[PDB]
Amino acid sequence: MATKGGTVKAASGFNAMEDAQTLRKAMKGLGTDEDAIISVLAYRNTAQRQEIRTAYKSTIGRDLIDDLKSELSGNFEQVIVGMMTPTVLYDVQELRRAMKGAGTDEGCLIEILASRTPEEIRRISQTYQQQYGRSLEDDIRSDTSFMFQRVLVSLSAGGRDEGNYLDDALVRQDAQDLYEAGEKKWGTDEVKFLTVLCSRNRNHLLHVFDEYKRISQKDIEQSIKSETSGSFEDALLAIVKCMRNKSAYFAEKLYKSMKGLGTDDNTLIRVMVSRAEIDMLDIRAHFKRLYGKSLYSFIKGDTSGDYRKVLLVLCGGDD
Ligand SMILES: [Ca+2]
Ligand SMILES: [Ca+2]
Ligand SMILES: [Ca+2]
Ligand SMILES: [Ca+2]
């Protein structure tokens, strides 16, 4: 009830070798058995899917992920491969993809860097270096600029204060500083905003937000919107939403990824996959609260085929 949890749980009586043979069997003939692949992979958690990769490489003597890529395509392949990717590496590969090539997927960078915990970020930074031979900070600096770059670099350090300690004097001054640096200033001391928003512990910031409303008669979101713009504004706003309620933040991302013509499949897939074993239950609750419709109704109405089948398993039910 409290921290609801994920929608993908460990399968009972798990046998990695058996599941591996099922997948091998499913990809052996003229025409792939997609439902068989789903029946196994969507119903095993990330840890179990890894044991299946190992077992597959043993008995079969082949790479499970590469073979799946050879028989699958489109969005169905993208979601399956994501589900097959180890937790930290998945985020790493998403950040890399967000920056590699012309332009940058700002939404993805902001999303991962603003919603991941200090500990999840340190792991991400370490695996990014391992995977690509350059630091995450290095690539951020190469793909982004100015204050947006500045904030992303700070988030990538994973240095936010931990704990829930409330230093009242600090809360009052932070609110005052943010007020002096924005509303009462011609222009904006953007580094003060990013510094306060990136380094203070969650509880502290929630109280800073209240104190700021108290002295300025404006929500910090209203001032951020009126004081900043572009990607810097987007980053700052994401940080605030993730501080107020992370599950609600993702609910809104899901909504926005499907609302309107077509689908932002990259966002839809990344969110469903990355939060399936963490707070999908809470995301579902917040999603229906915010929009009056279940996340299930949206996924079913925006997708089809095998891709839709897998996404609905990650959703884990209607509301
Ligand atoms: Ca780029
Ligand atoms: Ca100002
Ligand atoms: Ca603005
Ligand atoms: Ca749509």
Curated annotation (Swiss-Prot):
Its main location: membrane. The modification Phosphoserine is found at S12. Keywords: Acetylation, Annexin, Calcium, Calcium/phospholipid-binding, Cytoplasmic vesicle, Membrane, Phosphoprotein, Repeat. GO terms for molecular function: calcium ion binding; calcium-dependent phospholipid binding; calcium-dependent protein binding; identical protein binding; NF-kappaB binding; phosphatidylserine binding; phospholipase inhibitor activity; transcription regulator inhibitor activity. It is found in: Zymogen granule membrane. One of its GO terms (biological process) is negative regulation of transcription by RNA polymerase II. SMART domains: ANX. Seems to bind one calcium ion with high affinity. A pair of annexin repeats may form one binding site for calcium and phospholipid. This is Annexin A4. The lineage of its organism: Eukaryota, Metazoa, Chordata, Craniata, Vertebrata.
